[PDB]
Design a protein around this motif. Structure first.
Motif, PDB file in Angstrom:
ATOM      1  N   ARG A   1     -40.516 -44.939 -39.857  1.00 53.92           N
ATOM      2  CA  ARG A   1     -40.415 -45.597 -38.567  1.00 53.92           C
ATOM      3  C   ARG A   1     -40.030 -47.081 -38.655  1.00 53.92           C
TER       4      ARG A   1
ATOM      5  N   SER B   1     -37.974 -40.100 -31.137  1.00 49.29           N
ATOM      6  CA  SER B   1     -38.969 -40.667 -32.036  1.00 49.29           C
ATOM      7  C   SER B   1     -40.380 -40.628 -31.415  1.00 49.29           C
ATOM      8  N   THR B   2     -40.478 -41.041 -30.150  1.00 53.53           N
ATOM      9  CA  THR B   2     -41.743 -40.977 -29.414  1.00 53.53           C
ATOM     10  C   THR B   2     -42.292 -39.548 -29.447  1.00 53.53           C
TER      11      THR B   2
ATOM     12  N   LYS C   1     -37.010 -39.981 -20.421  1.00 59.10           N
ATOM     13  CA  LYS C   1     -38.150 -40.727 -20.944  1.00 59.10           C
ATOM     14  C   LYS C   1     -39.458 -39.960 -20.888  1.00 59.10           C
TER      15      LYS C   1
ATOM     16  N   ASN D   1     -36.485 -42.158 -27.792  1.00 62.72           N
ATOM     17  CA  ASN D   1     -37.144 -41.066 -27.082  1.00 62.72           C
ATOM     18  C   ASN D   1     -37.570 -39.933 -28.005  1.00 62.72           C
TER      19      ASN D   1
ATOM     20  N   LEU E   1     -46.233 -36.260 -23.784  1.00 60.34           N
ATOM     21  CA  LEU E   1     -46.827 -36.549 -25.081  1.00 60.34           C
ATOM     22  C   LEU E   1     -47.968 -35.616 -25.419  1.00 60.34           C
TER      23      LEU E   1
ATOM     24  N   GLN F   1     -43.762 -38.631 -32.985  1.00 61.75           N
ATOM     25  CA  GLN F   1     -45.049 -39.273 -33.279  1.00 61.75           C
ATOM     26  C   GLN F   1     -46.119 -38.386 -32.711  1.00 61.75           C
TER      27      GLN F   1
ATOM     28  N   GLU G   1     -46.535 -44.231 -25.627  1.00 59.51           N
ATOM     29  CA  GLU G   1     -46.467 -43.788 -27.005  1.00 59.51           C
ATOM     30  C   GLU G   1     -47.872 -43.367 -27.393  1.00 59.51           C
TER      31      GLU G   1
ATOM     32  N   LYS H   1     -46.666 -49.100 -23.754  1.00 61.77           N
ATOM     33  CA  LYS H   1     -45.603 -48.089 -23.723  1.00 61.77           C
ATOM     34  C   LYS H   1     -46.227 -46.706 -23.514  1.00 61.77           C
TER      35      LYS H   1
END
Ligand SMILES: [Cl-]
Length: 403
Positions: free
Chosen positions: A153, A270-271, A379, A268, A385, A274, A28, A26
């Motif tokens: 989570r 949540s990603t 996304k 989304n 990130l 993190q 992530e 993913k």
């Protein structure tokens, strides 16, 4: 190479099915070292037959295809879930069509989640909910004991102990995102970076809950941890556990703490959370992640009570923040000193009103912002990130400068 399924007997009546990928699963932050991963399923075949944790959507077809060649799915008594999400629910839809007789075993929060996630599936297998110290006898000495180990989570997270084999099925705890050929973890050093990175990304922002979990798990004389990801933990069990103890202590001992309050409908936001958390913790500032959808008021007051800054992450659902974000906002405004540093982020599709609402409310309430409000359209990508992690670092530095 390509995704596969590695099968290996691991204890009496017990087999592991490792769905392996050498690529990034993913976008992530936890997949960041790009060492691939595995999703581990387990089969106990005794007088009753239980399957733990079918893998998610990337793995659904290889897994079902492999499993039917080893198991008559009509003979499956139980499907045991260490945690639940849309990813896993996808596989369950297929698997439970094939095993209509099976009973789902899971925690109470996982159950509610699953009922939501399978609302429009045709499957109607029964669910048996398990709380702490509940049991499930598979025969031949495999009397399983269940141990809920919730975290923001993974609110439905459930660990399982098998005394016949001395295996603790630990789900997201004690794992590593690394794909290799070794089913077991011989050698400490080769896995050391992966294990710490895993902790740092997944567990550090939930240190109090993870400590609480490890406290409960100490009661079970496990010789092996059987986690969701990576090798089984046998050779490194003691050493990894002491390291967890030490890392948790470090986290809870840092002078500054950030309350990171978020919610996410499709994952989304949540990603993003993190990623921001990781930027903060890697800068030496603790994070108390709060999933507003599953948290309670005293949780939030407590977090806001000890934080130096707080950050809100929110999706937009019909042009509004989710209800749990609205109520979290109230508790936060009612309790946070105006000297706390503030942050706002979120994912959105057509519109991002929730983000705008929160920024406005916090500005009007006289808060200073620790990074420019973050808005991600649909996304998140690798670049997204990294930017969020950098914002978290920026936030952390801003807090440290303030003392
Ligand atoms: Cl969960």
């Amino acid at each position: 190479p390509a995704k596969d399924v590695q099968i290996c007997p691991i204890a009496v009546d017990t087999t592991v099915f490792r769905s392996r990928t050498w690529d990034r699963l993913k976008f992530e932050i936890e997949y960041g070292l790009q060492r691939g991963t595995t999703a581990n399923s387990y089969l106990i075949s005794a007088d009753k037959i239980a399957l733990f944790d079918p893998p998610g959507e990337s793995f659904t077809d290889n897994f079902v295809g492999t499993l039917i060649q080893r198991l008559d799915l009509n003979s499956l008594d139980y499907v045991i879930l260490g945690h639940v999400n849309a990813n896993r629910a996808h596989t369950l839809k297929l698997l439970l069509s094939l095993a209509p007789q099976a009973t789902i075993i899971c925690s109470n929060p996982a159950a509610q989640n699953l009922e939501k996630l399978l609302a429009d599936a045709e499957v109607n297998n029964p669910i048996q909910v398990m709380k702490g110290n509940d049991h499930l006898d598979l025969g031949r000495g495999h009397e399983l004991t269940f141990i809920p180990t919730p975290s923001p989570r993974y609110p439905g997270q459930l660990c399982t102990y098998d005394p016949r084999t001395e295996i603790l099925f630990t789900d997201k705890l004690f794992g590593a995102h690394v794909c290799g050929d070794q089913v077991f973890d011989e050698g400490w050093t080769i896995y050391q970076e992966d294990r710490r990175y895993y902790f740092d990304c997944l567990l550090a922002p939930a240190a109090a809950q993870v400590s609480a979990a490890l406290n409960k798990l100490e009661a079970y004389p496990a010789q092996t941890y059987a986690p969701s990801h990576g090798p089984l933990v046998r050779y490194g069990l003691r050493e990894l556990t002491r390291n967890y103890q030490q890392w948790l202590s470090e986290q809870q001992a840092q002078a500054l703490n950030v309350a990171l309050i978020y919610a996410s409908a499709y994952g989304n936001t949540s990603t993003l959370a993190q990623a921001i958390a990781r930027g903060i913790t890697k800068a030496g500032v603790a994070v108390t992640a709060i999933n507003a959808e599953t948290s309670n008021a005293e949780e939030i007051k407590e977090a806001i009570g000890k934080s130096a800054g707080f950050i809100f992450g929110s999706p937009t659902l019909g042009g509004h923040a989710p209800t749990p974000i609205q109520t979290a906002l109230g508790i936060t405004l009612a309790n946070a000193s105006k000297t706390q540093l503030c942050g706002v982020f979120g994912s959105f599709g057509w519109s991002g009103e929730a983000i705008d609402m929160l920024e406005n409310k916090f500005r009007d309430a006289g808060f200073s912002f620790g990074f420019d409000t973050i808005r991600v359209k649909f996304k998140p990508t690798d670049q997204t990130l990294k930017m969020c992690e950098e914002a978290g670092t920026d936030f952390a530095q801003a807090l440290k400068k303030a003392e």
